[PDB]
From Swiss-Prot, chains C, G:
It comes from the Eukaryota. The active site is at 96, 138. It comes from Drosophila melanogaster. The gene is Drice. This is Caspase subunit p21.
UniProtKB/Swiss-Prot annotation, chains F, L:
This is Death-associated inhibitor of apoptosis 1. Interacts (via BIR 2 domain) with Dronc (via residues 114-125). Rpr, hid and grim can outcompete Dronc for binding Diap1 therefore removing Diap1-mediated ubiquitination. Interacts (via BIR 2 domain) with HtrA2; this displaces any bound Dronc. Interacts with Strica. The N-terminally cleaved form interacts with Ubr3 (via UBR-type zinc finger); the interaction promotes the recruitment and uniquitination of substrate capases such as Dronc. Coiled coil: none annotated. Anti-apoptotic protein which functions as a caspase regulator, using its E3 ubiquitin-protein ligase activity to smother caspase activity. Binds, ubiquitinates and inactivates initiator caspase Dronc, and effector caspases Drice and Dcp-1. Acts as a Nedd8-E3 ubiquitin-protein ligase for Drice. Suppresses apoptosis by targeting the apoptosome for ubiquitination and inactivation. Plays an important role in cell motility. Overexpression suppresses rpr and hid-dependent cell death in the eye. It comes from Drosophila melanogaster. BIR repeats lie at residues 5-71. Belongs to the IAP family.
């Protein structure tokens, strides 16, 4: 299928998605897609895979927890095809600068 | 039958990175090191030996963390590795207190 | 042959004392020193560290941007105390640093100083007990390019 | 993924920086004695880190200087220094199974 | 939630390779350097080390009083080799030393040099494998008075 | 009491482990604890037991107690039933060093 | 002296095979037998067991109220199979039972039968591999008063 | 150099309770045994030896469970203890597969 | 809280029910040999359950019958039977610490 | 969520008591019973067992060919004692036996009897402590042919 | 204080109750009360104590999980002083019969 | 080949471990593996190494191989350089039983 880089394709993989309570839609929206095995979802932008969700685990923060570098998430430019780019822009984590001494580029 | 021991024994200095290198730090999540440290402590600190515990903190910092600085490609996708100089003389464990007596 | 169990050959540190022990965190975020830009979210390190430590039965206590002289007051005090009733002691430090030094609010300093407040001869309540120092110092200057796997 | 070029190193040298290393003329150094003693005793059974811990224990506990001509250097002590940056458990495993 | 088993998160070093790996011992006993009195029974350290190591399945090899330049030949060689078939590598050193340096037959040298022959970028057959350096250097200068303990 | 070699021998009454040299063993600072085959050194407080049919009293004493004042040949209150005997039996001489 | 590593002296079972192995659960809830009242929520045992097992990489398969003869078909089959490619095998059983017996849908039976389908001589693909049988049988008749602590 | 082994080795029968005793079972949560079994498996099954694993399943059933039957006081506040007859000849662990290669 | 009166028992008897127990006239039973062998070798170091496992391993692997007058009873095998209901880890721990 | 440390959830048996505990060995070698041929070197089992046990800090005590009635005297006694100061208790038995029974000097008997002297309700000094019974009984009747394995 | 057996007294202990998100009220209602130490709550009817709550852990089912016998919870008669007895009657778990062979008293 | 005692001795050429009876060791089915001090039995395939200065060849062979056909005195292809020597050296006689 016109493959996974498109948000559209990441959603169509969540067909037969168990775990009713969890936001199938927005989850796939943040680079996640169903592995079709239990509730394992994988990120197409960092290759992480996550499963066994408690009834409050939020898709973004939990993605962040297990993948602190994910290019999509830290907001690097990537092949992401956003079904709704404006939606992402609000949903995504703020902005994470990385430092190692001073290099005035933080809140400089 | 009385014995003596080095005054400089039982110390442990587990500082962020190998000497002469940078220490990376996310502005909105804290340092690579502290993140991995806490992560392990509240996850194993009770169950695990201190040395092997720190090993996994080393594993975390080394494996899970790239720099990601897209404005400064020269400092981008960089790596970090902690440095655990130890001179403990026995196994540290954060044990509790348990037993269960009798009638 | 086989030598008896001297128990000085105790396989593990005794960590069942009346209480865990003291844990002093030194959080630096702002500096009087020039060019030293403040540390971003060095606090959020602190919260977490505090959290996990207290969950580890520790007696946690924290000090914000301390002038070097203060640090030493603080340590010297802590050091002169009856640890005979505690498993050990831990100190942690958060700030910038260069090769061989660590920064206080006002100045850099080699940690070899604080280190020496706790040697058995200077602090016997801890003689045979473990002293733990963790540091988050940007200490150093070179970068690591790494290797792909 | 990528990993530090400076990871998986282990430097376990004789004594804390800026200190002497004691050595018996007719039995070798405090350190090597304790090292070998532990390796050929646990090296197969034990984790590398805890292994070295006991080598530290040996050097620190079992060894005084004993120099009766030089009382200033007499009944002195020594403690090794194991700066580590391994990222997993080292064990000197063999190879065993038993099929069917 | 819970992340999958990445196996890069392998809990232990893989030590089941075709063979253990190389183990180079550097025994110094005599020095061209002045005032450097020879090392007594530094050999008997060597024998023992050799012994235990070989019993540990290692490929042990030893070098007596080496001029510094030789050491580097030896390392550079060892380093440039296919370790892909071995669990790791170990080097050991026996001689005098001062704070920040180690002595060869002819000169002192900071070990930071040999260290750097094995970094992953300079030696990928060992990239991800453990490199072990043990030293018996009189390195330092101060003494430790110690502290007496309660009977045990 | 025990400082005399004579007294160290008279403690080996009812000494099990036939094969082992009761006499010379006691001679090198060892004496029976009267419990299995545990012997203790009066000059370093070490105690050793479970002996294989070749474990030599001196080298095994040395192994578990690398500093024993009597053994490394420091001057001690030892009352040698035969001082000349000791002089030959004892380990040679172990100097300790740390630089030059 | 010291004997070499025979590797038949393998300290652990080899559990890295191409796959875990088969896991057959026998859920009984209803019985043709008289006076045998049905088992309440014996299913919910099943779900959980299934769950945890599959999370353990097992090849799980379940059988509801089986007449005894069926059980044996099922086992005999399972037993005659190439386990050489799997770590082991596990069977579990849920139903009533008395001292020395277990109930099928239609009759009681001593388990010594099923047991014997897997002995090395009758099933070498598993020779040297572990066979695990778990039972939830009301097997027995006496009660346990316990002791306060 | 060829050897033989008992045909009856490597079996493990871990059934609910000591012979000649009842097996307690909650109508709406399943049996004491299965509850404790699953609980341990999905909690340690990966980390733990099979024998010690089952020990804790024994601990669970013995410690955490009283009968509670307020209509039949004779069957009330009763206890249960599993029965793990084993003849394994090595350590069972539910290991996975991990390594991490090189460049 | 309360606990089963029948908990914390361990019956580790020689062989699976309904089978023979082999025994060397001049070395004792397969079982006792392997038992002692393990106890005095691991009993201090090891968990009771895994300990017995290795006693099972010993009896099962290291022992054939060898009865050359009675081929019907020759080259036979044996396997112990460890029915357990302990509720925690048994270890033969000692007492150690080292103060200050 | 997460429940607190109840310490009744102690991961291990407490084995640091004032002393290990009693260990009673029952050595049978001769029998009044007919056709029961004496046990060869059943003693040498005993010595070894005794040895290792005492090395394990146990309070070891042994009983030779005991008439059944004696065994019970012995147990009943042992059982009625203050074990509150000991880690546990162990009994061992050496003799012939058939399926479901064990022989005394004079008669067979199912061990279910001795077993019951130590249940928590009958012996609380041991309530929560481990009771260990080892048996070397020819108990059973069938033979095991075994299975040959791949070289190793 | 006119002690803990009263639901009223179990609530007044939740003063200075951290963990905002969690239902302070109904939690105390089911035999739980604050230990005044982190988020550790203890049941007065079975002595259980529970802490570290994820953002969906439900007070009843989680109480049940760690205490399968709790007299209050399995619905034995206890000294409980229900601020609202009708509230409890709906909130509490259904009914858990215990069996061991047949003893027709289940869905007999 | 090895079935002959003669051939089992000629393998002990370059035999380290001076103290140990090269001759009689090979005599009891043992032969040098030519690797350290590992000797293997040709009659049961056992291999043993690291010998303490009293480990006796027979009892230590027996310890690690309780069934060895040669040792328990089964009839085997053994070619005894001195059959009478063996007859005295070998362990007595070990009957195996299981009821009466
Ligand atoms: Zn991602
Ligand atoms: Zn001495
Ligand atoms: Zn409750
Ligand atoms: Zn042989």
């Amino acid at each position: 299928m016109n493959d996974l880089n498109r948000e559209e394709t990441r959603l169509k993989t969540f067909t037969d998605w168990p775990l009713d309570w969890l936001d199938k839609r927005q989850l796939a929206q943040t680079g996640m897609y169903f592995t079709h095995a239990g509730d394992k979802v994988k990120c197409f932008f960092c290759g992480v895979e996550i499963g066994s969700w408690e009834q409050e685990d939020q898709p973004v923060p939990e993605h962040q927890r297990w993948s602190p570098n994910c290019p999509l998430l830290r907001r690097r430019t990537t092949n992401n095809v956003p079904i709704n780019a404006e939606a992402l822009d609000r949903i995504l984590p703020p902005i994470s600068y990385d430092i190692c001494g001073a290099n005035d580029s933080t809140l400089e | 039958m009385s014995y003596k021991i080095p005054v400089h024994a039982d110390f442990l200095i587990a500082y962020s990175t190998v000497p002469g290198f940078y220490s990376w730090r996310n502005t909105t999540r804290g340092s690579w090191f502290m993140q991995s440290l806490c992560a392990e402590l509240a996850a194993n600190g009770k169950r695990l030996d201190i040395l092997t515990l720190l090993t996994f903190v080393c594993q975390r910092v080394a494996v899970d963390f790239e720099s990601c600085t897209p404005d400064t490609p020269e400092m981008h996708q960089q790596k970090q590795i902690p440095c655990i100089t130890t001179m403990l003389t026995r196994i540290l464990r954060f044990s509790d207190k348990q037993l269960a007596p009798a009638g | 042959a086989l030598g008896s169990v001297t128990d000085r050959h105790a396989a593990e540190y005794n960590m069942r004392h009346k209480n865990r022990g003291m844990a002093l965190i030194f959080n630096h975020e702002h500096f009087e020193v020039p060019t030293l830009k403040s540390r971003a979210g060095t606090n959020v390190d602190c919260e977490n560290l505090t959290r996990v430590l207290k969950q580890l039965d520790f007696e946690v206590t924290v000090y914000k941007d301390c002038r070097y002289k203060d640090i030493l007051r603080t340590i010297e005090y802590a050091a002169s105390q009856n640890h005979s009733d505690s498993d050990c002691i831990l100190v942690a430090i958060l700030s910038h640093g260069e090769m061989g030094y660590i920064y206080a609010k006002d100045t850099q300093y080699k940690l070899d100083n604080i280190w020496s407040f706790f040697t058995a001869n200077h602090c016997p309540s801890l003689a045979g007990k473990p002293k733990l120092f963790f540091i988050q110092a940007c200490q150093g200057d070179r970068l690591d390019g790494g290797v792909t796997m």
